[PDB]
Write a protein that binds this ligand. Structure first.
Ligand SMILES: Cc1cnc(Nc2ccc(OCCN3CCCC3)cc2)nc1Nc1cccc(S(=O)(=O)NC(C)(C)C)c1
Length: 289
């Protein structure tokens, strides 16, 4: 529905490996009444990346949830590539940056509100047999002080009809300090591996994104900063097989650290569901209030 003639560039919000996101104003009447949107595009539009980009557009079109960023449409230039995905724009940016800028005004009860919203959005993803694979405070976006949203679906894959996991080894470097053990060793991605990663999201939240308490900082202080390249991954695998874990964040109540550890269970069938986590986090929140 969108025409690239009338999309007008304001600034770049983010740029990763295969894609980038720009703030733009859709102003079809050329009079500065149009609305400001977010536009995602590929920056190396190979054909494999393009077909995966279109499955992502189709996945995001199939989702409507208060905690999922809103799809708006697509746009094409002359031809049926240079394809662009149009989404709503959220003014407060990533939850990672929002939280370390207001760390002295956001208490634990507010952290738990975000947490339960993330859970409800993740639970909605699971009902449609989507695996996010990429959850982190980096990709959680902020609509306003009371609402967060899951903000990017570049790696979201749909489960096969028969099986409850997905095997993918990607070319390039992966965020291996959020990945469940069975994802490091066998590249299996399930809703239980997303629960592992939600545990480290919750860890991040309670570290208030303090620089020396990032999961990579803490993990690679546990295995030694001397480790080399591929050996890095191997050493982390061994540390997770011996029940080495991230430490409890400073000030974190023991109840919330028990939720974190229960998601970091080595036994994949023994991790809690997102609906159970939402109920645990809603009761901790209701007792604090
Ligand atoms: C879909 C969408 C809607 N609204 C926003 N709002 C937003 C608003 C301000 C942001 O500030 C970024 C920090 N500075 C960068 C320059 C301006 C400010 C960042 C994001 N972002 C959105 N997506 C987005 C924006 C930046 C990064 C990401 S991502 O890290 O999760 N994924 C990739 C873009 C790398 C694929 C996703």
């Amino acid at each position: 529905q969108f025409e690239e003639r009338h999309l007008k560039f304001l600034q770049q919000l983010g740029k990763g490996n295969f894609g980038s996101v720009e703030m733009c104003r859709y102003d079809p009447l050329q009079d500065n009444t149009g609305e400001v949107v977010a536009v995602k595009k590929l920056q190396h539009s190979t054909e494999e990346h393009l077909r995966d980009f279109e499955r992502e557009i189709e996945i995001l079109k199939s989702l409507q949830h208060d905690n999922i960023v809103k799809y708006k449409g697509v746009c094409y230039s002359a031809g049926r590539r240079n394809l662009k995905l149009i989404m709503e724009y959220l003014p407060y940016g990533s939850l990672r940056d929002y939280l370390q800028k207001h760390k002295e005004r956001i208490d634990h009860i507010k952290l738990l509100q975000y947490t339960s919203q993330i859970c409800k959005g993740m639970e909605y993803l699971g009902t449609k047999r989507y695996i996010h694979r990429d959850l982190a405070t980096r990709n959680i976006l902020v609509e306003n002080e009371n609402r967060v949203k899951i903000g990017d679906f570049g790696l979201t894959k749909v489960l096969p009809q028969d099986k409850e996991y997905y095997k993918v080894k990607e070319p390039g470097e992966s965020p291996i300090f959020w990945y469940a053990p069975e994802s490091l060793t066998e590249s299996k991605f399930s809703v239980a591996s997303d629960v592992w990663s939600f545990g480290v999201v919750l860890y991040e939240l309670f570290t208030y994104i303090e620089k020396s308490k990032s999961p990579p900082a803490e993990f690679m202080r546990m295995i030694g900063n001397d480790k080399q390249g591929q050996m890095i991954v191997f050493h982390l695998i061994e540390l997770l097989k011996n029940n080495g874990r991230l430490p409890r964040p400073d000030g974190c109540p023991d109840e919330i650290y028990m939720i974190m550890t229960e998601c970091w269970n080595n036994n994949v069938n023994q991790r809690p569901s997102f609906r159970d986590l939402a109920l645990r986090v809603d009761q901790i929140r209701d007792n604090m209030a």
